[PDB]
């Protein structure tokens, strides 16, 4: 079969629409998500036109084999989409109405800078390669673009599913290509991070600061070192749920900065002991008393500075 | 092939039934379960009707290819179901009796609020899209809905497998869709959680409270800090078997609250030491003696309050 | 094609046999195992009968497509078996001799009560659904049931592979079904558990009891708490290699009971210190001296009781 | 199609050869490896013979469908090999030269007794089932057996890829079978184990022995218990990279024996303290001084004994 | 179909080109990466030549089935590439222009010596086996070799995608083979390693050195042993993200060397205590004072030596 012939030198417009049925498995480490949707296509093939009076019928169904169907592909999919044709319906003027149900693992990158208080724009790119007979251009039929109400992405809030109506027309391997951008806007559900990582991590830090109200070196060493190990466990736990970024994430920055606080606490604990042993407990007392105010104040200000730079 | 023609303007009723053979792999993190069942369909196609006297046979078998079969799909499946046709049998009046065996990874969400003392309702949604010739409506043949006695879901108790007999009729891509709800009611086997997580977690907490019967700061610091680390391990172990929820789970609440008890224990231990050093052991004694009653009582009451709010 | 016609009202007997080639991947958590075997089938189709004098040949070979082959399925498989036909041979009387080589992930449940000193019976269920023309019944040709000598199931000892010769004939979706039970009896290789989990776990417990020969509270607290943490790690390690059971496993019981020994050791350590501080070292001495005999004796008796209840 | 006819009662010899392109994914836990190779087959079919003068051509190509090809299968593969026919070429005498490119997950067992200083022989078993017309026997065409120079198996050294030229001819499901053994000899690259597991494990043990030069019970308890926990971590890390064996591995034995050294160290530390407290520091001194020589000497001799038994 | 006939004895040149669409999943442990690209092929088949005047058309499209297409395979792929033909276009002279879109898991080895400051050259090997009719040789059409601007490999920087224009012509199973080398040059994004592994690891080491400003054996033992355990966790964490190499990696060397620093710190701590107890605090003071300079200086120089040897 060949593509529909042009009336003049005009390109063939294939109207598109994606309707999400099931949205699932957003892998932060892999920067992928799985989708299960409907793909609707519509174009005019004058060769298929018929008289509704003579033929009796208002629409004619066809099997994919019987007629010409444009080769529509997804750009950012991992492997080729699994698709099954739901319906093909031709109206008297020759307007074809194609529908298929597909599933695909889509590869759209993520920005972890404000993690876990981040929002993402997932992309689904539809493309079409022009044939030698005639050039093919994509379009968005807006009322065939949507999502099911049940659509739930675990640990995320689905904000919107829209399409950038103007296609990106460009050259690809010496032929015209018409690319379309479907955008799924989502925002992370940060709530769980607070009682599971943030608050436990702050509690262990504050426990390390009880060493500023203790003269026992043996006890202080235990307090600051033990809590430092628990902070290492939280750093490891966090960096497992995330990929290796060439930038600093919000949680990454806080976690890093907290190490400096543990390091300075070890210095103070060591200085206090050295001074007490050196028979200078007056000077050691001054340092310990100062640290009680310095550590919380510097921690609070440094966090104001970080939140400011990141948000 | 085309759909059966209507006697009048009535829709075509496709009677359905699902019979579970094997039920397995309930992923709490993914909110999926795997199923292996029979799907039975029945509708009347007058075009297939025959005289049993003239034809000799009481029923005629057909291959899927030969006749019209309604396109029935599952809504909440991950990928398209793996199905194999067992039998297609037509009675003299034209009543088709279709049977297929399928397997699918079903995506039904879970409510972890009462975890691990939770009960779930897993869903299997059957759907059918109306064609241009005539509208298709789903029905439940209750005699063809069931499950095998051997059906076992590891770590869960299977309560019931029933169907909501009235379908959800709605518009989908400008055509009528008839959705059916098959519900598998299950309840978690919480038994293992008691000797593996709950009792070990309470034992380490009670061990931390032996610091209220000790004047040794070095020993208390070791007792409260060491047991706090074991509690961190249990928090990490628990949050691995579960997904990130935008709400507080029952175990999540208990685990969180227990951190506060460790934090207050560190404060008491620090206060006792400061006072003893400051030559005020009488005041330190009062605080330590009070804590012995306060900590268990506040723990017991806070748990009564939590169990009340969650159940 | 249609099934062979009956001489009288007799059912069609399909003789079966399974010969295991490779047996592997027994997942304790999933209660599945993978199998690679031969499935042999034999039935008489008088329609295929031929004169060996006239046809030249003593046997005729056919492609699956050419003749009627009974639809034999496995009940407890995860997804549909991967099968490849090795041979189909028809003798002059019409006796068909079918051979296929298949691979499948079989879902047979396990009893972890005596873990890791448990024995299992894995099941492979063959089934056949009767057609409208005539009823089909399964049989076991014992000469075609076996296993290769090389058959090795990692971490398990293969005892026997036999078949329950009498099929389970029952109604399934309003038609007769003939089910057959192939049983693979295996027993766990418990050896590795002894130097990797059991002996390391006993060593750490006995180390905790060296606190009954020490008056140093600071040292005792370190001894009992540190070893309790190592026991937590062993409990976690063990519960990872196993699924969540609604019953107590043998190792589960020992692991649980050992927590009580750690808890009572903390009590003794605390009592000894309180008494020594309260200027009652005579009473503290009596308790410590008693514990030295009590702890090993109670541990030994409790283990005799457990081994008795479980075996 | 039927197999080639015999001149007399001789069997048909199918000459074989495997040439490895890519060798990868040796799973120690699963005892599997993945292979990507060429399979070459050659046999004489007199029916295909032709006169090169009359036909013009020196060789004739055929599609698998056109001619008879022996059913060659792999015994120890997991699932059926993925194969694609590269070429089929017939010489004037009727000698067929078949070539296919395949990939398979091969299941060959491993001997971890000398781990990580072990060498393995991976097996690829080719088999052929005799037909009723005539018996089929396998052979090795040695210059069609090889491997690519680039062939690399991560963490292993590939020594040789050869075939046991004499096939194993035996009865299988009442027909003759010709099995061939292709052996891939490999040896583990033990280098990484030394700086990552062996030396770190010895360092922590030697650190525990610094307790023989200390009279501080509190410090000794910390030294021996802390290092014992690090040894537990190494035991866990090692047993994860390996399957559960019914025998003792080399590393397994060393790891186990090291626990006894920790146990005896705890005993010595306890005895020293009891004696010092009991006002017998002279006797405690003798034991501590002896342990300084005993522990390293017994460790060194026990290791000589182990290396001897294992190598 | 047969290959194009030669004008004279010349070989057939198949011009190639790979254009990367999506590049993802670089597994360091497995030494694999997944690719999703276009494969373009071009060769002259005089049999397909046509007169553009008589035929009307300037180019003719063909289905893969209709014409002869060279069997091009990838050497270092895991399983056979997933490919879908985009276009086949013939010009009047008979020049065929083939285009297909494929996805494959490519197995290219990696050099971890400078990890995580390493650069890699990933390979994609295209090959072609000569037929009996005529020899086939590969070529690189440089205008049809490229990559998309959006091409992103998570945690890596894509430097270049080029091809070694001269093919490797060699014998394979007694026939000529033409191999082509496509090289994807990438360099690791080491940034994340600094705040997550390197700086945390140095902080814990420096904390261990605060024992040179302390006379408390009990505190020193806690300081050096606790920090040694955190270093063990970092060694384990690092060796999980990497495969077992027969050489020393950069991070591997630093990690190993740091163990020696912990071991010598334990010796110093032990010596200081023994001497103080032996009533030689003057000598213990000299050693402790020296260690304060020795440890940082030796650490800094040893690191200069390592960086020099590795870079
Ligand atoms: C002379 C002391 C020898 C102690 C030997 C202990 C052997 C235990 C063997 C267990 C085998 C399983 C059960 C744990 C006992 C801890 C031993 C404490 C020793 C205290 C010694 C006091 C100095 C007189
Ligand atoms: C505690 C410390 C344990 C050290 C174990 C030493 C290794 C060993 O003794 O290993 C033994 C292997 C043997 O290699 P083979 O070829 O299989 O010898 C087979 C010999 N027959 C056939 C005669 C029986 O020697 C090596 O790889 C030596 C280099 C490794 C040294 C690592 C030191 C750290
Ligand atoms: Cl696609
Ligand atoms: Cl479906
Ligand atoms: Cl609606
Ligand atoms: Cl409608
Ligand atoms: Cl099956
Ligand atoms: Cl095979
Ligand atoms: Cl390929
Ligand atoms: Na088409
Ligand atoms: Na149909
Ligand atoms: Na058949
Ligand atoms: Na054939
Ligand atoms: Na301590
Ligand atoms: Na072709």
Coordinates of C-alpha atoms in Angstrom, one line a residue, chain C:
Chain C
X1 CA -9.7 -30.9 13.8
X2 CA -12.1 -32.9 16.1
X3 CA -11.3 -35.5 18.8
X4 CA -11.2 -39.3 17.9
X5 CA -14.7 -40.9 17.8
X6 CA -15.7 -43.5 20.4
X7 CA -16.3 -47.2 19.5
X8 CA -19.0 -47.1 22.2
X9 CA -19.6 -44.6 25.1
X10 CA -16.1 -45.1 26.5
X11 CA -13.9 -42.0 27.3
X12 CA -10.5 -41.3 25.6
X13 CA -7.5 -42.3 27.8
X14 CA -4.4 -40.1 27.3
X15 CA -1.4 -41.9 28.9
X16 CA 1.1 -39.5 30.4
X17 CA 4.7 -39.4 31.7
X18 CA 7.1 -36.7 32.9
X19 CA 10.9 -37.2 32.8
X20 CA 12.9 -34.4 34.5
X21 CA 16.1 -33.3 32.7
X22 CA 17.0 -30.2 34.7
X23 CA 15.5 -29.2 38.1
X24 CA 16.6 -25.7 39.5
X25 CA 15.8 -22.3 41.2
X26 CA 13.8 -23.3 44.3
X27 CA 12.8 -19.9 45.7
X28 CA 11.8 -20.3 49.4
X29 CA 10.3 -16.7 49.6
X30 CA 8.2 -17.3 46.4
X31 CA 7.4 -21.0 46.9
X32 CA 8.4 -21.7 43.2
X33 CA 10.8 -24.0 41.4
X34 CA 11.9 -24.2 37.8
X35 CA 11.8 -27.5 35.8
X36 CA 13.0 -28.6 32.4
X37 CA 11.5 -31.9 31.4
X38 CA 10.0 -34.2 28.8
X39 CA 6.2 -34.6 28.6
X40 CA 5.2 -37.8 26.8
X41 CA 1.5 -38.4 25.7
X42 CA -0.2 -41.5 24.1
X43 CA -3.7 -42.0 22.9
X44 CA -5.5 -44.0 20.1
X45 CA -6.9 -42.2 17.0
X46 CA -8.4 -44.9 14.7
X47 CA -8.7 -42.2 11.9
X48 CA -4.8 -42.3 11.7
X49 CA -4.7 -46.1 11.2
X50 CA -2.9 -47.4 8.1
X51 CA -1.7 -50.6 6.3
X52 CA 2.1 -50.9 6.7
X53 CA 2.3 -53.1 3.5
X54 CA 0.5 -50.5 1.3
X55 CA 2.1 -47.4 2.9
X56 CA 5.6 -48.9 3.0
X57 CA 6.4 -47.3 6.4
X58 CA 6.0 -49.3 10.0
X59 CA 5.2 -45.8 11.6
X60 CA 4.1 -42.4 10.3
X61 CA 5.5 -39.1 11.7
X62 CA 3.2 -36.0 11.8
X63 CA 3.5 -32.3 12.6
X64 CA 1.3 -31.1 15.5
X65 CA -0.7 -29.0 13.0
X66 CA -1.6 -32.2 10.8
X67 CA -3.4 -34.2 13.6
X68 CA -5.6 -33.8 16.7
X69 CA -3.5 -33.5 20.0
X70 CA -5.2 -33.3 23.4
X71 CA -5.0 -29.9 25.1
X72 CA -3.0 -30.9 28.2
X73 CA -2.3 -28.0 30.6
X74 CA -0.4 -27.6 33.9
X75 CA -2.5 -26.3 36.8
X76 CA 0.1 -24.8 39.2
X77 CA 2.4 -23.1 36.7
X78 CA 3.0 -19.4 36.9
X79 CA 2.9 -18.5 33.1
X80 CA 2.2 -21.0 30.2
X81 CA 4.9 -23.7 29.8
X82 CA 7.5 -23.2 27.1
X83 CA 7.3 -26.4 25.0
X84 CA 8.9 -27.8 21.9
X85 CA 7.7 -30.9 20.1
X86 CA 10.5 -33.6 19.9
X87 CA 8.4 -36.3 18.1
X88 CA 4.9 -37.5 17.1
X89 CA 4.8 -41.1 15.9
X90 CA 1.7 -43.1 14.7
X91 CA 1.7 -46.9 14.6
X92 CA -0.6 -48.9 12.1
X93 CA -3.5 -49.3 14.6
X94 CA -3.6 -45.5 15.1
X95 CA -1.7 -45.2 18.4
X96 CA -0.1 -41.8 18.6
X97 CA 3.1 -41.4 20.6
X98 CA 3.8 -37.7 21.4
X99 CA 7.0 -36.3 23.0
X100 CA 7.7 -32.6 23.8
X101 CA 10.4 -30.9 25.9
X102 CA 9.2 -28.1 28.1
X103 CA 10.3 -25.6 30.8
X104 CA 8.0 -24.1 33.4
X105 CA 8.1 -22.1 36.8
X106 CA 5.9 -24.3 39.0
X107 CA 4.2 -22.8 42.1
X108 CA 4.0 -25.5 44.8
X109 CA 3.7 -24.3 48.6
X110 CA 6.3 -25.1 51.3
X111 CA 6.2 -26.0 55.1
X112 CA 8.9 -24.1 56.9
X113 CA 7.9 -25.4 60.4
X114 CA 11.1 -27.5 60.8
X115 CA 13.4 -25.1 58.8
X116 CA 16.3 -25.6 58.0
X117 CA 15.8 -29.4 58.9
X118 CA 12.6 -29.5 56.6
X119 CA 11.6 -31.9 53.8
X120 CA 9.2 -30.8 50.9
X121 CA 6.9 -32.4 48.3
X122 CA 6.9 -30.3 45.2
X123 CA 3.8 -30.8 42.8
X124 CA 3.4 -30.7 39.1
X125 CA -0.3 -30.9 38.1
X126 CA -1.3 -32.1 34.7
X127 CA -4.9 -31.4 33.6
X128 CA -7.2 -32.0 30.6
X129 CA -10.6 -30.5 29.8
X130 CA -13.2 -32.8 28.2
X131 CA -14.7 -31.6 24.9
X132 CA -18.3 -31.7 23.8
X133 CA -17.7 -34.7 21.5
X134 CA -16.2 -37.0 24.3
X135 CA -14.8 -37.0 27.8
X136 CA -11.0 -37.2 28.2
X137 CA -9.3 -39.0 31.2
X138 CA -5.6 -39.0 32.1
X139 CA -3.4 -42.0 33.0
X140 CA 0.2 -42.6 34.1
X141 CA 2.5 -44.8 31.9
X142 CA 5.0 -45.6 34.7
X143 CA 7.8 -46.6 32.3
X144 CA 7.8 -43.0 30.9
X145 CA 8.0 -41.3 34.4
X146 CA 11.5 -40.6 35.8
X147 CA 14.4 -38.2 36.3
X148 CA 18.0 -37.9 35.0
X149 CA 20.8 -39.0 37.4
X150 CA 22.6 -35.6 36.9
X151 CA 19.4 -33.8 38.3
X152 CA 20.6 -31.6 41.1
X153 CA 18.6 -29.0 43.0
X154 CA 21.1 -26.6 44.7
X155 CA 20.9 -26.8 48.5
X156 CA 18.4 -29.7 48.4
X157 CA 18.5 -33.6 48.2
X158 CA 16.1 -35.1 45.6
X159 CA 14.5 -38.2 47.2
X160 CA 11.9 -39.4 44.6
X161 CA 9.9 -38.4 41.6
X162 CA 6.7 -40.4 41.4
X163 CA 3.1 -40.0 40.1
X164 CA -0.3 -40.6 41.9
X165 CA -1.6 -43.1 39.3
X166 CA -5.4 -42.4 40.0
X167 CA -6.5 -39.1 38.4
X168 CA -8.8 -36.6 40.2
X169 CA -11.9 -36.5 37.9
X170 CA -14.1 -33.4 38.7
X171 CA -16.4 -30.7 37.2
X172 CA -14.7 -27.5 36.0
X173 CA -16.7 -24.7 34.3
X174 CA -19.5 -27.2 33.5
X175 CA -17.2 -29.9 31.9
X176 CA -15.3 -33.0 33.1
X177 CA -11.6 -32.4 34.1
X178 CA -9.0 -35.1 34.7
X179 CA -6.1 -33.9 37.0
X180 CA -2.8 -35.9 37.7
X181 CA -0.4 -35.4 40.6
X182 CA 3.4 -35.7 39.9
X183 CA 5.3 -35.5 43.3
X184 CA 8.9 -34.5 43.7
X185 CA 10.1 -35.3 47.2
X186 CA 13.1 -33.3 48.4
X187 CA 14.9 -32.6 51.7
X188 CA 17.0 -29.5 52.7
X189 CA 20.8 -29.7 53.0
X190 CA 21.0 -28.0 56.5
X191 CA 24.8 -28.4 56.8
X192 CA 25.7 -24.7 55.7
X193 CA 23.3 -23.3 58.4
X194 CA 25.4 -24.8 61.3
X195 CA 28.8 -22.9 60.7
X196 CA 27.1 -19.8 59.2
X197 CA 24.1 -19.1 61.5
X198 CA 23.6 -21.6 64.4
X199 CA 27.2 -21.8 65.8
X200 CA 28.0 -18.0 65.3
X201 CA 24.6 -17.2 67.1
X202 CA 25.5 -19.5 70.1
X203 CA 29.0 -18.1 70.4
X204 CA 27.6 -14.5 70.7
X205 CA 25.1 -15.7 73.4
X206 CA 27.8 -17.4 75.4
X207 CA 30.0 -14.3 75.2
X208 CA 27.0 -12.3 76.8
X209 CA 27.1 -14.8 79.8
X210 CA 30.7 -13.9 80.6
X211 CA 29.0 -10.9 82.4
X212 CA 28.1 -13.3 85.2
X213 CA 31.9 -13.5 86.1
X214 CA 32.3 -9.7 86.0
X215 CA 31.4 -6.9 88.6
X216 CA 32.1 -4.1 86.1
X217 CA 28.7 -2.6 85.1
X218 CA 30.2 -0.6 82.3
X219 CA 31.8 -3.8 80.8
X220 CA 28.7 -5.9 81.4
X221 CA 26.4 -3.3 79.7
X222 CA 28.9 -3.4 76.7
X223 CA 29.0 -7.2 76.7
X224 CA 25.2 -7.8 76.8
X225 CA 24.1 -4.9 74.6
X226 CA 26.8 -5.5 71.8
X227 CA 26.0 -9.2 71.6
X228 CA 22.2 -8.4 71.5
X229 CA 22.9 -6.2 68.4
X230 CA 24.7 -9.2 66.7
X231 CA 21.7 -11.4 67.5
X232 CA 19.4 -8.7 65.8
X233 CA 21.6 -9.0 62.7
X234 CA 21.2 -12.8 62.7
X235 CA 17.4 -12.5 63.2
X236 CA 17.3 -10.1 60.1
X237 CA 19.6 -12.3 58.0
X238 CA 17.5 -15.4 58.7
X239 CA 14.0 -13.7 58.1
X240 CA 15.3 -12.5 54.6
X241 CA 15.9 -16.1 53.3
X242 CA 12.2 -17.0 54.3
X243 CA 8.6 -15.8 53.6
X244 CA 6.2 -14.4 56.3
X245 CA 4.6 -17.5 57.8
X246 CA 1.4 -17.6 60.0
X247 CA 3.2 -20.1 62.2
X248 CA 6.5 -20.4 64.1
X249 CA 9.4 -22.0 62.3
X250 CA 12.1 -24.0 64.3
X251 CA 14.9 -21.4 63.8
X252 CA 12.3 -18.6 64.4
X253 CA 11.4 -20.1 67.8
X254 CA 15.1 -20.4 68.9
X255 CA 15.9 -16.9 67.6
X256 CA 12.9 -15.5 69.5
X257 CA 13.6 -17.3 72.8
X258 CA 17.3 -16.1 72.7
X259 CA 15.9 -12.5 72.9
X260 CA 14.4 -13.4 76.3
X261 CA 17.8 -14.6 77.5
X262 CA 19.3 -11.2 76.5
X263 CA 16.5 -9.4 78.3
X264 CA 16.9 -11.4 81.5
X265 CA 20.7 -10.9 81.3
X266 CA 20.1 -7.1 81.2
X267 CA 17.8 -7.4 84.2
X268 CA 20.5 -9.4 86.2
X269 CA 23.3 -6.9 85.2
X270 CA 21.1 -4.0 86.3
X271 CA 20.0 -5.7 89.7
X272 CA 23.7 -6.6 90.5
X273 CA 24.7 -2.9 90.0
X274 CA 21.7 -1.5 91.9
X275 CA 22.5 -3.8 94.9
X276 CA 26.2 -3.1 94.9
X277 CA 25.5 0.7 94.9
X278 CA 22.8 0.2 97.6
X279 CA 25.6 -1.4 99.7
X280 CA 24.2 -5.0 99.4
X281 CA 27.0 -6.8 97.5
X282 CA 26.3 -10.1 99.4
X283 CA 22.8 -10.3 97.8
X284 CA 24.1 -9.2 94.4
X285 CA 26.8 -12.0 94.7
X286 CA 24.1 -14.7 95.3
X287 CA 22.1 -13.6 92.2
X288 CA 25.3 -13.5 90.0
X289 CA 26.5 -16.9 91.2
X290 CA 23.0 -18.4 90.6
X291 CA 22.8 -16.9 87.1
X292 CA 26.0 -18.8 86.1
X293 CA 24.2 -22.1 86.5
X294 CA 20.5 -20.9 85.8
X295 CA 21.2 -19.4 82.3
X296 CA 23.0 -22.4 80.7
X297 CA 20.6 -25.0 82.4
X298 CA 17.4 -23.1 81.4
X299 CA 18.8 -22.5 77.9
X300 CA 19.6 -26.3 77.5
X301 CA 16.2 -27.4 78.9
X302 CA 14.2 -24.8 76.8
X303 CA 16.0 -26.2 73.7
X304 CA 15.2 -29.8 74.6
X305 CA 11.5 -28.7 74.9
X306 CA 11.5 -26.9 71.5
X307 CA 13.2 -29.7 69.6
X308 CA 10.7 -32.1 71.2
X309 CA 7.7 -29.9 70.1
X310 CA 9.0 -29.4 66.6
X311 CA 10.3 -33.0 65.9

